[PDB]
């Protein structure tokens, strides 16, 4: 599923991403835009055989089990396929654990490069939330 911008923002807000660990909602919407272009079925293989899954491109090395990444550890206790659903709950629940893991949102490279330091309010412009 490909979300609209404000559509995604509302679902993220529902699940309490707005201001979560001090990151306003626009950070998360921006992250989703540049990690997945709002596509829940996005996947990106990493060079090491691990794979980033879903709307927030959560990586299989540590966070989910795909049965095909080195080391598997599965800190979110989910199959990686759950991160590919049209409903963002698994992705959001896992994101909350990742952002509390000692580097804040820097764990998302696309956020770091395209969102960090910016006027993120743009990402929730026009939403009725």
UniProtKB/Swiss-Prot annotation:
Segments forming domain C-type lysozyme: 1-129
Membership in a protein family: Belongs to the glycosyl hydrolase 22 family.
Organism: Gallus gallus (Chicken)
Entry's EC annotation: 3.2.1.17
Chain positions recorded as substrate binding sites: 101
Stored CDD domains: LYZ_C
Disulfide-bonded cysteines: 6-127, 30-115, 64-80, 76-94
Keyword Transcription regulation: no
GO molecular function per UniProt: beta-N-acetylglucosaminidase activity; identical protein binding; lysozyme activity
Pfam families: Lys
Subunit structure: Monomer.
Extra remark beyond the main annotation: Lysozyme C is capable of both hydrolysis and transglycosylation; it also shows a slight esterase activity. It acts rapidly on both peptide-substituted and unsubstituted peptidoglycan, and slowly on chitin oligosaccharides.
Compartment annotation: Secreted
Coiled coil: none
Active site as annotated: 35, 52
Keyword tags: Allergen, Antimicrobial, Bacteriolytic enzyme, Disulfide bond, Glycosidase, Hydrolase, Secreted, Signal
Tissue: In the egg white and polymorphonuclear leukocytes.
Keyword Transcription attached: no
Gene Ontology biological-process entries: cell wall macromolecule catabolic process; defense response to bacterium; defense response to Gram-negative bacterium; defense response to Gram-positive bacterium; killing of cells of another organism
Record-given protein name: Lysozyme C
Catalytic activity reported: Hydrolysis of (1->4)-beta-linkages between N-acetylmuramic acid and N-acetyl-D-glucosamine residues in a peptidoglycan and between N-acetyl-D-glucosamine residues in chitodextrins
Chief localisation class: secreted
